[PDB]
């Protein structure tokens, strides 16, 4: 369970970062 969750969070970390990056200049 934990092994998968760590992977989920790592991916979300990247995805939220990308979103924060795209709305950053708006």
**Burial class for 10, CB neighbours closer than 10 Å (0-12, 13-18, 19+):** exposed
Distance CA 8, CA 2 (A): 10
Q: How far is CA 3 from the centre of its chain?
A: 17
Sign of the C-alpha dihedral computed for residues 14, 16, 17 and 23 taken in this order: positive
Distance CA 26, CA 22 (A): 8
- Give the single-character DSSP code of 25: T
User: In which domain, by residue range, is 5 found?
Assistant: 1-26
**Which tokens go with 4?**
């998968």
Distance CA 26, CA 11 (A): 24
- Give the single-character DSSP code of 26: -
Total domain count for the chain? 1
Structure solved via? X-ray
- Give the single-character DSSP code of 4: H
Q: In Å, what resolution does this model reach?
A: 2.1
């Amino acid at each position: 369970e934990v092994y998968k969750l760590d992977a989920n969070v790592k991916r979300l970390e990247k995805e939220v970062g990308k979103l924060e990056g795209e709305v950053a200049r708006l």
